[PDB]
């Protein structure tokens, strides 16, 4: 639709922290939009991308794709400032076909957003226990 | 039998410290069960595995195998980012044959558990003196 | 003869410090006895070896050999504990022949122990000045 | 002539510091004499060499050569002692011929010792400005 300052509420292990994002333009090379947290150093900030795609003569299917990464700085050595030690990636891809209606496309998104809060799935991610 | 919270008492040089473990599922790829200490970071915790095996057309013998490792963290560089300095393993394998009764299988376990507390053996491990 | 706790007195630049050693068995692979200082970590302790040898069909001479090493440990920043950074070794080999009597063998040892306290030799070692 | 404790006065940016040196023998391998500052660790001390040479059947010219180096050491970071980080070498070579008298040989030394205190030369070394 149109980029804006996407705000977010009730995020965390408790669900009390918030997070605000700012738009940072659309890359016209490959259609990838971007959002970012208002940080200072451009390698210590959270970012979110999103990029729809279109069927060519090769692929013949739509493909929505969302990426999230979260660097965490630490390890100040000496008196120079902080540098990145770890990463935490994410990925979501959709593969809707051509003649699909919109109830199906909403149903997939709805059940994914509901299934990311089931007790099995937070047992799987937050504790790294395999489903058994 | 069935996994549960295996508790342990009188462990140490003095025999006063305790240790509690929690079950973390059975890997169905190779039958290896697992236990673990309730830690936060998944590379700074003690773990114990155990895996019985069965005779195939190649091996023709049962084989019980137990592994123990104990990493030791250094938090010199800051609590948020500790690095494992060094490790310390263990290994126990049994090789009982097919027609063995159960008194023999209990006798081997009993004499191993008794021989790991003889003065010769704690002279060997705790001081690294060769038996002479 | 027989290993025991070899004690030592009047050692140092002033000759006031002492040092005590403990026996740690005889390696039967190559006849090398060992002594050690009662330390905790097995890479931060002083050690002394001694190993007589016998004439084979190839060498035809006795060969007494004594080795001494003294590791130095300091702890660098952001590290939980001591490491080893410099060592100072030593070596003494004797090559007595077959028909030698015992007065000669005592005379060599006596003049070596006397010559390691002459002013020329402590000028050579403790100051690294070449003999000129 | 003969080695002795060469003392020095009025050295520095202000010309108030002093420096004393001690003889440390003549290397008979290549005629290179040596002086040194009375330090403890043999890699953290200033040293000065000097070595005359003689005409062979190949070179046919005398060659006096003087070398100076000054290591500098930064202080402890943990407790482990002083290390060497940078060096500052120097070099002076002379190439007097065979039939040269002594007034010429004194004149070269005199004008070099006078020219190392001209304002152009201390503008060149102490500020690293090229002569322009």
């Amino acid at each position, epitope marked *: 639709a149109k980029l804006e300052t996407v705000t977010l509420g009730n995020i965390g292990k408790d669900g009390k922290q918030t997070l605000v994002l700012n738009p940072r333009g659309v890359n016209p090379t490959n259609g990838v939009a971007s959002l970012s947290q208002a940080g*200072a150093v451009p390698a210590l900030e959270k970012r979110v991308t999103v990029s729809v795609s279109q069927p060519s003569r090769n692929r013949k299917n739509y493909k929505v794709q969302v990426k999230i990464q979260n660097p965490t*700085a*630490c*390890t*100040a050595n000496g*008196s120079c*400032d*902080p540098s990145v030690t770890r990463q935490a990636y994410a990925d979501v891809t959709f593969s809707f076909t051509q003649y699909s209606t919109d109830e199906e496309r909403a149903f997939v998104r709805t059940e994914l957003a509901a299934l990311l809060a089931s007790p099995l799935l937070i047992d799987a991610i937050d504790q790294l226990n395999p489903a058994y | 039998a069935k996994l549960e919270t295996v508790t342990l008492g009188n462990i140490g040089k003095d025999g006063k410290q305790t240790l509690v473990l929690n079950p973390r599922g059975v890997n169905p790829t190779n039958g290896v069960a697992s236990l673990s200490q309730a830690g936060a970071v998944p590379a700074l915790e003690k773990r114990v595995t155990v895996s019985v095996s069965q005779p195939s057309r190649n091996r023709k013998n049962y084989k019980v195998q137990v592994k123990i490792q104990n990493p030791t963290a250094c*938090t*010199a*560089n*800051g*609590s*948020c*980012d500790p690095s494992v300095t060094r490790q310390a393993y263990a290994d126990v394998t049994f090789s009982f044959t097919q027609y063995s009764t159960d008194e023999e299988r209990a006798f081997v376990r009993t004499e191993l558990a008794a021989l790991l507390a003889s003065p010769l053996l704690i002279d060997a491990i705790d001081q690294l003196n060769p038996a002479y | 003869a027989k290993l025991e706790t070899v004690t030592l007195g009047n050692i140092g630049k002033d000759g006031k410090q002492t040092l005590v050693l403990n026996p740690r068995g005889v390696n039967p692979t190559n006849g090398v006895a060992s002594l050690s200082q009662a330390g905790a970590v097995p890479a931060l302790e002083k050690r002394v070896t001694v190993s007589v040898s016998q004439p084979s069909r190839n060498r035809k001479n006795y060969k007494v050999q004594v080795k001494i090493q003294n590791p130095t440990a300091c*702890t660098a*920043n952001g*590290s*939980c*504990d001591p490491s080893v950074t410099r060592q100072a070794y030593a070596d003494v080999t004797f090559s007595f022949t077959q028909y030698s009597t015992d007065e000669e063998r005592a005379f060599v040892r006596t003049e070596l122990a006397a010559l390691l306290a002459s002013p020329l030799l402590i000028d050579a070692i403790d100051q690294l000045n070449p003999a000129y | 002539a003969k080695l002795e404790t060469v003392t020095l006065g009025n050295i520095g940016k202000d010309g108030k510091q002093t420096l004393v040196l001690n003889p440390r023998g003549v290397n008979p391998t290549n005629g290179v004499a040596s002086l040194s500052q009375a330090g403890a660790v043999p890699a953290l001390e200033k040293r000065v060499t000097v070595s005359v040479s003689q005409p062979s059947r190949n070179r046919k010219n005398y060659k006096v050569q003087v070398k100076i180096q000054n290591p500098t050491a930064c202080t402890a970071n*943990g*407790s482990c002692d002083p290390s060497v980080t940078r060096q500052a070498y120097a070099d002076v070579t002379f190439s007097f011929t065979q039939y040269s008298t002594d007034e010429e040989r004194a004149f070269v030394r005199t004008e070099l010792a006078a020219l190392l205190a001209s304002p152009l030369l201390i503008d060149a070394i102490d500020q690293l400005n090229p002569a322009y």
Partner: antibody
Amino acid sequence: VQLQQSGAELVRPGASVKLSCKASGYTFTDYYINWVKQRPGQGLEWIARIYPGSGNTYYNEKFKGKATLTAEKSSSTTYMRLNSLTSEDSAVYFCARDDVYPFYFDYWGQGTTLTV
Amino acid sequence: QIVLTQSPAIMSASPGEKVTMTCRASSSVSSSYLHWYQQKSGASPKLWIYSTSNLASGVPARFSGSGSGTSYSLTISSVEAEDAATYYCQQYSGYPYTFGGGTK
């Protein structure tokens, strides 16, 4: 999780003192421990810092030869020693625990005054 | 090596106003290293703002620090009674730490 220091005291000048604050409620050798001087009429400043699991002391250059401090691992305390006492130092002395990424001080203890 | 200046030293209290104190360094103290503490009239201090942006646990809703560079500030909106005692600030750059002068 807390830590308490000591009571009030006074010494006559020229002497030397001991101070201590004992920790409780966490594993002792895993966090740094500092000391902090607050002269009462003025702003408050920092003096020394040591890690108990090793021996590593870094100190302020104003008070470089004034204070020495050690740490005993068994009783889980930390001793600090002054010398050549005078009427220049008469203040409350704090000790606080931190770890390291954003260097700030977690947990302050109640202060120990000192008079000369 | 680094010197702080907190430009007010005394302030007045009225329960509806909007008050703000600032601080200024003598060099480029980096962000995310500097903090704010409030000390009561007769007790040990405690944390108020860490890394100049977010808040501690027992902090109420309305105090918010800001600033980028070498001149930072804390802004109080809707002050009430039993709030203002002292406000120090301190940062760590290079090596010896240094605290603020103080304000109230």
